[PDB]
Structure formats: structure tokens, C-alpha cells
């Protein structure tokens, strides 16, 4: 029953009542406990079109996290065009928790189970669903953490490379295990990855690239300018804002006790607003070992509009794209 529309969606999670940290405290009143039996209805002999970038469902998630982030991590100072603000800024406990969005009455959501689906046009095998699988909301530039992984092969998703400026996005078949650390110079930080995982991924990436763009010599190079967040890999890990050098990881042509590549990060009291234009000031750090093991699930890049070569450079900026990588194969329809 192909009939797309606009609605006001609602959240779902496994929030905890005793708890004091942010995410779940937002969840306890903004939504509902998970139903331990999510069912699926396969639709035999039906194929249907979709355009995987023009979606209100993304915007609602986008607006939710804004209305989440603004009220909970309350900064010390805020500023943009003729306007300055300062409130109380306590350090808070924090983590990412998996979320499902769900469908109101006279209406349901579907699943494009084409694991070889790119974005454009028809989904072959399809089913219907009450609510999506769990996703913890990852606020990150360049890289995609803790999200949804590929099952068959590593596939690429962008509007069209003919319109280059359309940010290109990636999701992977296997996960890269990363650990970041700041010990108890209290500003300078660092991050760690063991070479062999990173080297082969980009090899298998380059191999799927020489196909998508017919003919080439795949070269990887870093960012070229503009503000901090996008030029770096910027992210949150419990009560701060990480900003890490990404210069080494984009390293030219990749060709067909375990050694670790180590990246010089730093933290910032000062952050450029990701919702709109604006620059932000937060509480200084707390003492001790600051660590998170989290896994990379994909990546954002942009086709470099320069040279008869194959220069691919890190993306980011927008967070609507950050939402795109996991909700990809979950849709909007009327029962009629």
C-alpha cells in the first residue's frame, strides 16, 4: 500500500528509573519502555520505490536530539550574532543508549531488507514493522560509531556522484575497535587503533570504489580548511568534547606487539554549535582515567572537486547525514 505522508513520530527505549545521567532521564518522560516482542510482516511479491535522502523521519530525530542536547548538557556560556548567555554548568554523567522510533495509528513502518540496496529506486524484498531496531545517537564528525553494520558486503550511499557536493557516506562489513584516553598537560589527549584493521578496510574500500566510479587510482587525503569540528574527528565521551588529529589515517594509495597508530587529540572548553551557527563554552574536565571503547560502523566523505586523480577527503558538518546510516531501510506509509 504505497502512500507516503507527514506525521508526528514518537520515541521508545529501555530507560531506567533510578538513574541520574542524561539520555535515559530524557527518555523516561519523552517516551516508552520497549515491547519485548517486536513483530515483522513479510510482503510477498511486492517491490516499491524510495528516495533515501528526502525524509521527515530524519528531521524529527534531528529535532529530538536538539531538544535533548539543549536542556541537559547546560553549558557555562553561549554566543551568536548580537546575543550572549551564561548559566550554571555542572559536569554530568552520560552514555549512548539504543532507541526505537514508532508509528501512530492508521499507519505503520516498513523494512527494505535488500542488503544490496544503495538508496536509489526500488527495494526488491520488503516487510512491515512496528518499530525500528535500537540505535544510540552518535554525535560525530567524519566517522560513524556504534551504529548499524552491513551484513553481506560493504556498500556505499550518496545522492549521486555527478552532483559531487552531495556528501558521500559509507557503512562497513566489519567493525574497528577503538579506545580513547585522557590520563589523571591536562588538555592534550590521544586515540588508538591497531594498523592491520584500518589498512585492510581502506583496501576493501578502495576496491569497491574503483567500481562505483568506473576506472581509477584511489587516493586518500585529509580535510582542506574551514572550522574545527569537520576538519577533525570531534565527539563526546561521557562529559567533554574530543578533537583529534586525523592527518595520518587518510594516507594516499592503498594497494592489494601488533603495532598501533596513535593520534594526537586535544579537548576543548570551546565548541562550534552543530545545530545552528554558534560557539559554546562548557565546564572544565574532572580528574582521572577518561576512557571509552566504542566501534566504527561507517564514514562520511566528500568527492574532492580537484585533479584528474581520485582524491577523497573527510566529510561531516551536517548531522542529518549522521542519522541516515542506520535508519536507511525503514520507511513511511498509510494503510488504505
Amino acid at each position, epitope marked *: 500500500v504505497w502512500k507516503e505522508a507527514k506525521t508526528t513520530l514518537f520515541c521508545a527505549s529501555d530507560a531506567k528509573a533510578y538513574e541520574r545521567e542524561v539520555h535515559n532521564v530524557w527518555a523516561t518522560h519523552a517516551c516508552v519502555p520497549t515491547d519485548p516482542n517486536p513483530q515483522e510482516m513479510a510482503l510477498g511479491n511486492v517491490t516499491e520505490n524510495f528516495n533515501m535522502w528526502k525524509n521527515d523521519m530524519v528531521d524529527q530525530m534531528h529535532e529530538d536530539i536538539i531538544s535533548l542536547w539543549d536542556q541537559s548538557l547546560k553549558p557555562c556560556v553561549k554566543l551568536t550574532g548580537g546575543s550572549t548567555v551564561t548559566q550554571a554548568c555542572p559536569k554530568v554523567s552520560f552514555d549512548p543508549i539504543p532507541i526505537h522510533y514508532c508509528a501512530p495509528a492508521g499507519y505503520a513502518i516498513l523494512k527494505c531488507n535488500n542488503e544490496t540496496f544503495e538508496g536509489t529506486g526500488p527495494c526488491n524484498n520488503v516487510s512491515t514493522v512496528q518499530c525500528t531496531h535500537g540505535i544510540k545517537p552518535v554525535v560525530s564528525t567524519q566517522l560513524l560509531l556504534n551504529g548499524s553494520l552491513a551484513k553481506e558486503e560493504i556498500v556505499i550511499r550518496s545522492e549521486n556522484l555527478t552532483d559531487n557536493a552531495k556528501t558521500i557516506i559509507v557503512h562497513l562489513k566489519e567493525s574497528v575497535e577503538i579506545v580513547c584516553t585522557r590520563p589523571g598537560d591536562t588538555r592534550q589527549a590521544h586515540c588508538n587503533i591497531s594498523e592491520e584493521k584500518w589498512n585492510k578496510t581502506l583496501q576493501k574500500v578502495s576496491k569497491i570504489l*574503483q567500481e562505483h566510479f*568506473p*576506472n*581509477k*587510482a584511489i587516493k586518500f587525503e585529509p580535510h582542506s580548511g574551514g572550522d574545527l569540528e569537520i576538519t577533525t574527528h570531534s565527539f563526546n565521551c561521557r562529559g567533554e568534547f574530543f578533537y583529534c588529529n586525523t592527518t595520518k589515517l587518510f594516507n594516499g594509495t592503498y594497494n592489494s606487539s601488533n603495532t598501533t597508530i596513535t593520534l594526537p587529540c586535544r579537548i576543548k572548553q570551546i565548541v562550534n554549535m552543530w545545530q545552528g551557527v554558534g560557539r559554546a563554552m562548557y565546564a572544565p574536565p574532572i580528574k582521572g582515567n577518561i576512557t571509552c571503547k566504542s566501534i566504527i560502523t561507517g564514514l562520511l566523505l566528500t568527492r574532492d*572537486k*580537484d*585533479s*584528474n*586523480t581520485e*582524491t577523497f577527503r573527510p566529510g561531516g558538518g551536517d548531522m542529518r547525514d549522521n542519522w541516515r546510516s542506520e535508519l536507511y531501510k525503514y520507511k513511511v506509509v498509510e494503510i488504505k
Partner: antibody
Amino acid sequence: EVQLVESGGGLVQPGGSLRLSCAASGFTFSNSGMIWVRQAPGKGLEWVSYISLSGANTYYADSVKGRFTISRDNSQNTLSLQMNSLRVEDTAMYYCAKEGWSYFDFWGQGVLVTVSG
Amino acid sequence: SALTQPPSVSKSLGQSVTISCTGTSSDIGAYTGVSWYQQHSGTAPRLLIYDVSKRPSGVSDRFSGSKSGNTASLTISGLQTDDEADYYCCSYRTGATYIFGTGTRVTVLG
């Protein structure tokens, strides 16, 4: 109507210097890569140099490497080729050409550079 | 180091002619950034085929391009008097470089 106007051809003594200019109109000069191409009298064509739209990425051939220099001005919409330490084997008809992508539509009329004493 | 063409081929008016273009596993075998070009004696070259088989606007359909393993090929059907010229193929090589073919002189008989 797209054009490529070449100038600066003529005789140079061997070891001497010359600079070639290619003037462009009818399209956006930036957003497009550019190439120099020479043709020795009665011989096959050979690629000289590549420059990218913003610059920064410049590529050269070996029988020319270290002697020729590619530059562009994205305001005046001009391509420049500075040539030093010229030998007689370089005597050729020289062409500037616009890049589509990995292919090359639209060509200059050709300026002949002769290297002789 | 160079792309091998037959130096000369010869057919009649209306007939079809095939030019072969041979390189290495580092240029033609890997890539489809392949482009064919026409050169009458003493004029500027004109773009014919690009990306193996594609035609730009301004080029007669009688021309067609192809690729297999390590060899590119050009096909000109319905031969005319205008078609009498030198022909060259072009390829991207590993290391952002480009390389040109030896040249095929097409002679239209009768």
C-alpha cells in the same frame, strides 16, 4: 562559444628560455582541469603537463620533469607554461586543452615552439 | 611504455574499419577513462569517444568504442571522405599520468 587563444611561440636558442600563455573564454576556467600537449614535426602527440582547477595538484612527464612548470591564474583565466633548459627534441607544435573528466574537449589552434641556435 | 596501434589501416567508402589499441594492466585493463581523438593534418584534435563508449554532442554516431582485458578498440561504420586522417587513443595510468597511442593513419580508398 568556447575559445583557447595561444601566444608566446617562436625561436629559442638551446639552453634558453620561453614562456607560453593560453587565454580562455566561454566557460568557467575554475571547475575544469587543464593540459599542455606537444607534437614534434611529423611525430605522434605526447602529453606535457596537468594542472588541477584550484591548482596544488600538478603532474609532469619524465622527459620534461624539472625543466617545465605549469601554473594558472583563476582570475585572469590564463594558463601558463614556463620552459627552461630547452633541447632540440622539444621542437614541437604546442596545444593547450580543456578537461571534461579524464577526457579533453576543445583545443587551442597551436603555437609552434622551435628550439634552434 | 607506449600504447600500441597499427600504423595504418585501409578500407573503402561505406565499409567499416577497426582500430586496435593495446596497453598494460596498469592503464587500459584497470581503467575506463578511455578517450578517442581525430586529427586531420595541421589542425587541432577533436574529441570523439570518452569513457570507453560514450559520445559527446557534435560527433556522428558512425563512430563507436569498446574494451576487453588489455585492449581498446574503435569502430567507424559508413565511411566518408572526411574520415581520412590520423587517429589516437588516450588512457589514465597508475600515478595520475596520461599516455598516448602511436597513431593510425586511415586511408579511404576508391
